[PDB]
């Protein structure tokens, strides 16, 4: 089926939160008796790429960054149907910018009446392939809106091991969705202490550290199963290869403080069986940005300058997004750049284990029967 | 480090379009805004407009709107302030006004809406 | 719109005396006014900016505060090249519909 899905959220209604108030205006209760039937022997072919759910939840929250983070000057193209000197002249709007407060809230996708959502539950899954392990529900797990490049934020973790998945390997242009097992934490503050604004005629300074003794583990078992794609070839990491500043660098949101954290030192080393980092606070150099890209269409923006102090983002890391660099100069190497920035790989790292299905139930089989007549 | 440099003091009859420029140097000029402000003979400073020279945009005065807009041409670092339909109200003194603004390239932009950066102003005067 | 009032038309000063104005909005304002200053036919130097932040140039004998409505500024040691023309410009409105201010004078005793 190809229908629409009513969100199910546990809000507030009170805070001046806006995923709460935004929960509280379009979204209902979350079912507080849940029932998951389990199928029998069955089999699925769960597509996960060409699932159009996940063309929906991306058309439901830029209808929520509408109602959020109103921009200053929110510049976007335009064009006119003039064949080829195209005339394509920008038009912007002029908002009030109010800096309001920022957290995201799990939501669950459920089904309407007359539809059904099914679930896959191995271990592995592979992605686009056939499980056996199917089972009906009515509503989708917590699903956190988080909305992030290079490193999938706060979200599901694996079951038991780290699974790889990508559309088509080997053809070094569908992203590969890495989902760890263990949840890599990250804690990204500014206390105040740099109210220096310019330097000549910092504010724009932030940090982040990862646990150098705990994430060398979940990385050590990344390479152990892209090896396992790859036999004779070398896992070779490295920084991203240029573009727009929200794809070089990590990007993720805390109380619109657009943080650009520069995640070199944690992609430079080089891979084998054996390490090649060191031998605990890796300082992951961030900065606040005003000038951004917007993810939800082609245009720039502008945002209202970065609070006082006291930003912190107590976060997590479930997920991780590599590209590849494949080719005939390939001399027995395996690149692996950070990439992402297209939202809708962010969520099918999310919603892979569902599918809406409808119930035909007329059926034509061959008997032994005869009409009377 | 920056400075200014105004057009010249030119008369014109009221109904006429009106075309005041400012070069600068010692920056890029699309490291910052820039700003207009109007001197009257005997009045205050009243505020025209504010050009942001990244995004070409501009904000103006509700009385000013159908009759003003401004243009940066970063090729030549040149600001233009296009006044048509002149009337004998706007016979003032018209310059140009900046602003630093800390790496607007990269993304760290500011938001000073103060001036700091001022240049000398020529005569607007109608008959 | 938005209106700045100016409490006195001039200011009946001396040099080497204290010298204090006053600048009245006609709604609520943030710290985001900045003082000017004004010499007749020259460029208006600014002088303070977030009324509580000297420019790269302007001297220990100027200085402000205030918040809300009333905005005050100070003048330690009036100096003879201060005696200048004074302006009240704010900016807190997105989009930009401020105005201007009416500004106050320095006197001469004649």
């Known amino acids: 089926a190809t229908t629409t899905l009513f969100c199910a959220s546990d809000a507030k209604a009170y805070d001046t939160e806006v995923h709460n108030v935004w929960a509280t205006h379009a979204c209902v209760p979350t079912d507080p008796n849940p029932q998951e039937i389990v199928l029998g022997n069955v089999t699925e072919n769960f597509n996960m790429w060409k699932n159009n759910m996940v063309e929906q939840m991306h058309e439901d929250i830029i209808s929520l960054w509408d109602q959020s983070l109103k921009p200053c000057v929110k510049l976007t193209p335009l064009c006119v149907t003039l064949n080829c000197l195209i005339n394509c002249n920008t038009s912007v709007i002029t908002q009030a910018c109010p800096k309001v407060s920022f957290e995201p809230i799990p939501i669950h996708y459920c089904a309407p009446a007359g539809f059904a959502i099914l679930k896959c539950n191995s271990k592995t899954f592979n992605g686009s392939g056939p499980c056996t392990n199917v089972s009906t529900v009515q509503c989708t797990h917590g699903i956190r809106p988080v909305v992030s490049t290079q490193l999938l934020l706060n979200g599901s973790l694996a079951e038991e091991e780290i699974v790889i998945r990508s559309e088509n390997i080997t053809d070094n242009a569908k992203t590969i969705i890495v989902q760890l097992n263990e949840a890599v934490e990250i804690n990204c503050t500014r206390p105040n202490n740099n109210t220096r604004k310019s330097i000549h005629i910092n504010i724009r300074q932030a940090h982040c550290n990862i646990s150098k003794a705990r994430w060398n583990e979940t990385l050590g078992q990344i390479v152990a199963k892209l090896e396992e794609q790859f036999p004779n070839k070398t896992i070779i990491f490295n920084h991203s290869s240029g573009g727009d500043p929200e794809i070089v660098t990590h990007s993720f949101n805390c109380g619109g403080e657009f943080f650009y954290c520069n995640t070199t030192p944690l992609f430079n080393s080089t891979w084998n069986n054996t390490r090649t980092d060191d031998y605990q606070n890796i300082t992951l150099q961030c900065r606040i940005k005003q000038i951004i890209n917007m993810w939800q269409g082609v245009g720039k923006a502008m945002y209202a300058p970065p609070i006082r102090g006291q930003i912190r983002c107590s976060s997590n890391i479930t997920g991780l997004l590599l590209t590849r660099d494949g080719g005939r100069d390939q001399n027995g190497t395996e690149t692996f750049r950070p990439g992402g920035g297209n939202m809708r790989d962010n969520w099918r790292s999310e919603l892979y284990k569902y599918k809406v299905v409808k119930i035909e139930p007329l059926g034509i089989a061959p008997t032994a029967c005869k009409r009377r007549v | 480090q920056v400075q200014l440099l105004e057009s010249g003091a030119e008369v014109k009859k009221p109904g006429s379009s009106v075309k005041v420029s400012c070069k600068a140097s010692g920056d890029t000029f699309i490291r910052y805004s820039f700003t207009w402000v109007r001197q009257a003979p005997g009045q205050g400073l009243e505020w025209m407009g504010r050009?942001?020279?990244?995004?070409?945009?501009?904000h103006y005065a509700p009385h000013l709107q159908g009759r003003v807009t401004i243009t940066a041409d970063k090729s030549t670092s040149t600001v233009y302030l296009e006044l048509r339909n002149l009337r004998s109200d706007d016979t003032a003194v018209y310059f140009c006004?900046?602003?630093?603004?800390?790496?607007?390239?990269?993304?760290?932009?500011?938001?000073?809406?103060?001036?700091?950066?001022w240049g000398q102003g020529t005569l607007v005067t109608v008959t | 719109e938005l209106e700045l009032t100016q409490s006195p038309a001039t200011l009946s000063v001396s040099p080497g005396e204290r010298a204090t104005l006053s600048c009245r909005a006609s709604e609520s304002v943030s710290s985001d006014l900045a003082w000017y200053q004004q010499k007749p036919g020259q460029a208006p130097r600014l002088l303070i900016y977030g009324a509580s932040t000297r420019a790269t140039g302007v001297p220990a004998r100027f200085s402000g505060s205030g918040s809300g409505a009333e905005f005050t500024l100070t003048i330690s040691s009036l100096q003879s090249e201060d005696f200048a023309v004074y302006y009240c410009?704010?900016?807190?409105?997105?989009?930009?519909?401020?105005?201007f201010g009416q500004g106050t004078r320095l006197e001469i005793k004649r």
């Open positions: 050009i942001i020279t990244i995004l070409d945009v501009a």
């Open positions: 006004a900046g602003v630093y603004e800390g790496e607007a390239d990269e993304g760290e932009y500011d938001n000073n809406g103060f001036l700091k950066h």
């Open positions: 410009q704010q900016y807190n409105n997105w989009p930009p519909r401020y105005t």
